[PDB]
Design a protein around this ligand. Sequence first.
Ligand SMILES: CCc1cccc2cc(CNC3CC3)c(=O)[nH]c12
Length: 330
Amino acid sequence: STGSATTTPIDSLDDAYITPVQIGTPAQTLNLDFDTGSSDLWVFSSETTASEVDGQTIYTPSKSTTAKLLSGATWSISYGDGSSSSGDVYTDTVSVGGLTVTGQAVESAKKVSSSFTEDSTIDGLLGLAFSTLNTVSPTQQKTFFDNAKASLDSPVFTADLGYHAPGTYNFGFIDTTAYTGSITYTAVSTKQGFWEWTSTGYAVGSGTFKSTSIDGIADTGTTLLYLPATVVSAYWAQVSGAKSSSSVGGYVFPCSATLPSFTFGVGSARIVIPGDYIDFGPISTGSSSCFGGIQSSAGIGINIFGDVALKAAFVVFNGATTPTLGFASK
Ligand SMILES: CCc1cccc2cc(CNC3CC3)c(=O)[nH]c12
């Protein structure tokens, strides 16, 4: 089997991407944030505290004839940005772009933190990291990808995120028309439950490539590119007037600037992030100071190749017995 679904930016900045997911019988379609940095499929639901729902589409398991309460099971997750959610668990039928899994754990939120409430466009998350990170207790549950894997034509999924435009998540096959040149594969460590790999270095604009190992995670659920302070300093030094602002909480730059590209290494290959991808717009409405799309990972504890980086590439998440990651230009 295979599946293919379009993923759409939630706003004009590409803060995140939503992909439609069918849950239950008859289908209830929710727009979920596919997140390769976590491993829970959770949704706003009829069980979510009413004051914490503001415009989201909810899953109502009582209206699904295939829903079954997973007895005694609960979940609770906290994300890098300090947001959180928690609740109970059902199993139900879940389909993405024509690919169907029966008995998928669907984690129904009883509580969500303010940032989720305040974002009416995201109805939940679909985790695509490794199932070892799944928070369901007392019996850990598998991700949608892990459940589908054996049925897929090939044990892979691909992320092709757009810049200010729709893109595609494919399951079970590699669309060879979706990228240029070849896919370069690189080793993955699953020891922390993430798609963790090591970039071979970077360049800023037309500058020379610096060969240096940068360990980090391929994370579709993080907006920005988080890298070591030395690297980030080298980037923003090429932008007149750019500076790290303590009050804003990162590097900002004059909105009148033309940003340089940023290149990252994948083995001997090179992925080029155009400068425009690094512009995240005014820090506040009407401001002429703009927020940067490359920020320091210092104090996160890990480097994160988020959407800013991933959207510059066609990315293969290879779930073979020994997982690997593939990158191609596009
Ligand atoms: C993509 C992220 C993003 C985009 C656009 C603007 C901002 C602004 C801030 C800083 N505001 C905090 C200090 C009160 C931020 O942290 N992330 C932004």
